[PDB]
Amino acid sequence: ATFEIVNRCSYTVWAAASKGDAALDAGGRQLNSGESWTINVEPGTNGGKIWARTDCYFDDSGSGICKTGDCGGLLRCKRFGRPPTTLAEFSLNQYGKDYIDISNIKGFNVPMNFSPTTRGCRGVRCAADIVGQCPAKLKAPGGGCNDACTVFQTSEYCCTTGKCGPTEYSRFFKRLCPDAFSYVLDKPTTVTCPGSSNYRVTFCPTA
Ligand SMILES: [Cl-]
Numbered sequence: 001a002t003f004e005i006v007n008r009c010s011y012t013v014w015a016a017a018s019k020g021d022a023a024l025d026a027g028g029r030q031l032n033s034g035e036s037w038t039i040n041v042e043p044g045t046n047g048g049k050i051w052a053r054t055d056c057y058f059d060d061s062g063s064g065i066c067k068t069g070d071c072g073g074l075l076r077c078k079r080f081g082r083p084p085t086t087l088a089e090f091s092l093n094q095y096g097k098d099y100i101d102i103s104n105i106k107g108f109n110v111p112m113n114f115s116p117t118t119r120g121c122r123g124v125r126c127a128a129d130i131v132g133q134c135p136a137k138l139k140a141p142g143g144g145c146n147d148a149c150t151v152f153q154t155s156e157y158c159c160t161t162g163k164c165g166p167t168e169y170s171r172f173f174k175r176l177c178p179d180a181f182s183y184v185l186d187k188p189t190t191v192t193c194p195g196s197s198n199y200r201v202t203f204c205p206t207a
Contacts, residue, residue, distance in 0.1 A: 001040070001041045001042075001043060001045070001092055001098075001196060001197070001198055001199070002038055002039070002040060002041075002117075002198045002199070003017070003038070003039050003041055003050065003198070003199045003200070003201060004036055004037075004038045004117065004198075004199070004200040004201070005017075005031065005036065005037045005038070005039065005050060005200075005201045005203075006031075006035075006036045006200060006201070006202045006203065007031035007032065007033060007034065007035050007036075007052075007203045007204070008033075008034070008202055008203060008204040008205060009033060009052075009110065009203050009204035010033050010204070011033065011054065012030060012031065012032050012033065013030075013031050013052040013053060013054060013110060013203055014028055014029065014030050014031070014052070014053040014054075014056045014066060014069075014075070015028060015029055015030075015031050015037055015050065015051075015052060015053075015201075015203075016028045016050065016051050016052070016053055016069060016071055016077040016081055017039055017041070017048070017049070017050045017077065018048070018049060018071065018077045018078060018079060018080055018081075019045055019046070019047055019048045019049070020047060020049075020079065020080055021078075021079070022078060023076060023077055023078050024039060024041050024042075024045065024048055024050075025039035025040055025041065026039070026076055027071075027074070027076040027077040027078060028053075028071070028074065028075050028076045028077045029075075029076075030056075030075075031203075041090075041092065043092055043093045043196060044092060044093045045090070045091070045092045045093075046091045046092070046094065047089075047091060048089070048090050048091070048092070049080060049087050049088065049089050049090075050087075050088040050090075050114075050201050051069050051081055051085040051086060051087055051088065051109075051110075052068075052069060052085070052086070052109060052110040052112070052203050053066040053067075053068055053069035053070060053071075053081060053085075053109075054066060054067055054068045054069070054109060054110065054143055054144075055067035055068070055142075055143060056070075056075075058075045062074060062075035062076055063075070066081075066082075067142040067143045067144075068081075068082070068084055068085060068109040068110075068140070068142065068143050068144045069081035069082060069083075069084075069085040069109060070082045083106040083107040083140075083144075083146055083147060083150045084106065084107025084108055084109045084140050084143075084144035084145055084146045084147065084150070085106050085107060085108075085109050085144075086102065086103075086104065086107075086108045086109055086110055086111065086112045086126060086130075086180075087102065087103040087104075087105070087106060088100070088101075088102060088112060088114040088201045089101050089102070089103055090199070092195075092196070093195050093196060094195075096195045097192050097193065097194065097195050098192070098193040098194065098195055098196070098197045099190050099191070099192055099193070100114060100116075100121075100124065100190065100191050100193060100199070101114075101124060101180070101181060101188070101189055101190045101191065102114055102124050102125070102126045102177070102179065102180040102181070102189070103180055103181040104126065104130070104147065104173040104177060104180045104181060104182055105147055105149070105181050105182070105183060105184060106147055106150065107138075107140070107144055107145055107146045107147040107150060108126070108130040108131065108134075108144060108145045108173065108177075109131070109143065109144035109145075110203050110204065111126060111127040111128070111129075111130075111203065111204050111205065111206070112125070112126055112127070112201060112202065112203055112205070113125040113127065113200075113201070113202040113205035114199065114200075114201050114202075115199065115200055115202070116193050116197045116198065116199055116200075117197075117198045117199060117200050118193075118194070118197045118198045119194070120193060120194040120197065121191050121192065121193035121194065121197065122191055123191070124179045124180070124189060124191055125177075125179060125205060126176075126177035126179065126180040127177075127204075127205050127206045128176035128177055129176075130145050130173065130176050130177065131143070131144055131145050133172075133176060134172075135169065135172055137151065138151060138169060138172075147169070147173075148167060148169035148170065157169070157170075157183075158184075159183065159184035159185060164183065164184060164185055165185075166182070166183060166186070167183065170182040170183035170186070174186070
């Protein structure tokens with residue numbers, strides 16, 4: 001499966017791609033404003049995620065730090081990134097179908113469109129100005145808008161017991177981006193695509 005990752009933001013992002021215990025493709029790369037990076041993701045990849053990282057520095061060896069989405073200080077991510085990170089999430093070739101979503105469960109940093117480039121399903125988008133409108137208590141000083149679980153570490157926000165409801169904080173994310181997951185037990189906004197579809201993740205899809 002191919003994912004074209006496109007940075008339409010006016011600022012540089014460092015794209016990242018991981019399934020939590022391994023990189024997808026090279027795992028990460030710099031994308032200046034306007035750049036595209038096409039990656040190959042192995043069929044059957046379950047629980048894959050793509051995200052943007054902002055304000056990164058890396059040495060010649062690919063070690064450093066990012067202000068949002070840092071993955072253990074690596075340019076080439078092997079693990080998931082530090083919140084806040086808008087997430088493009090996907091599981092591929094699951095009994096003949098692909099499943100895609102956008103999630104704000106680990107906060108929001110950069111707006112995103114996540115769309116198939118092949119036939120048979122729709123895309124999803126979270127392009128509202130979540131950082132600008134972020135509730136005071138969720139604003140990350142390093143940049144971005146944290147989820148409430150990251151900030152407050154309660155069973156209700158983290159849905160630790162498997163029982164949780166929507167919250168004032170989850171409703172904020174849901175208000176701004178109805179088509180993205182706002183908390184663990186949100187009514188799903190997962191799209192079912194044909195098995196072996198291809199995709200494009202666009203950062204800052206709209207002005
Ligand atoms: Cl900020």
